[PDB]
Ligand binder design. Structure first.
Ligand code: CL
Lengths: 225, 50
């Protein structure tokens, strides 16, 4: 029933940079069967489907790239457990799409990123974002910081404290970044950190200036109320 | 949209205090370095005495 459609989806999706309309329809059918949770053959075809979908993120057509991100988003929502071994690859592919020249692709990537941050293992996601936050270019680093915030909102105190030496250096550095969006994203991330460990965050912020501390505390007292 | 502009104005309203604190941190690092240079040389002077 579905196995005959999948064969079509595979051979169609492997047609890179050709037959745009046929691949849109195949993507829509896949996405529809994911949302409806009618796809009973994820246990058989997930790996191949995912890899062909991630390769589709680099298509020439922006409408194809945007649609593939929407499909990826729904697969993340309904089959998050299957991304355990492809977590790193999916994260980097989703973040990379944020620097797309076309706004529809960037928007889809943002939607896919927000879902990804809650569909992935918390500890695993932080350890892959930390080097990205510190080294990547705008706005990929910005997207990585926002994703890290969503993850920290879903961890315990003990889990976060064991990951603090990896997280904090990037946020401190990011508070001094050129882009105001990155600086603002770092403040909001620190607020999320404070929401978990409380005043145990203070000694990690010994490097920050007085006014930078006052701006952070302004958003902290704003969040709890 | 407006949240970004508020954040950017809060930074500006403390811009002067920001620069004085940055400069202070630089001066504090230089003093600390000079203090280590003195300790290093006083150790030599003490050793060269007897
Ligand atoms: Cl497979």
């Amino acid at each position: 029933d579905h196995s005959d459609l999948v064969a079509e989806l595979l051979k169609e999706l492997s047609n890179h940079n050709e037959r745009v309309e046929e691949r849109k329809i195949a993507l829509y059918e896949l996405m529809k069967l994911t949302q409806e949770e009618s796809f009973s053959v994820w246990d058989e075809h997930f790996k191949t489907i995912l890899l062909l979908l991630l390769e589709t993120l680099g298509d020439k057509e922006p409408t194809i790239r945007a649609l593939a991100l929407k499909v990826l988003r729904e697969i993340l929502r309904h089959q998050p457990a299957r991304f355990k071994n492809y977590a790193e690859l999916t994260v980097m592919k989703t973040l990379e799409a944020h620097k797309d020249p076309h706004k529809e692709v960037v928007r889809s990537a943002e939607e896919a990123a927000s879902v990804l941050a809650t569909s992935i293992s918390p500890e695993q996601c932080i350890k892959v974002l930390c080097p990205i936050i510190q080294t990547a270019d705008y706005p990929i680093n910005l997207a990585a910081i926002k994703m890290q915030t969503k993850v920290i909102e879903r961890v315990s105190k003990e889990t976060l404290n064991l990951l603090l030496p990896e997280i904090m250096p990037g946020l401190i550095q990011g508070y001094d970044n050129s882009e105001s969006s990155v600086r603002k994203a770092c403040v909001f991330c620190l607020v999320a950190v404070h929401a978990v460990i409380g005043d145990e965050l203070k000694p990690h912020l010994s490097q920050l200036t007085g006014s930078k501390m006052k701006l952070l505390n302004l958003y902290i007292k704003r969040a709890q109320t | 949209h407006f949240e970004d502009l508020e954040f950017q104005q809060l930074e500006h309203e403390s811009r002067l205090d920001e620069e004085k604190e940055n400069l202070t941190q630089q001066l504090l690092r230089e003093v600390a370095e000079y203090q280590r240079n003195i300790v290093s040389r006083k150790e030599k002077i003490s050793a060269l005495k007897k």
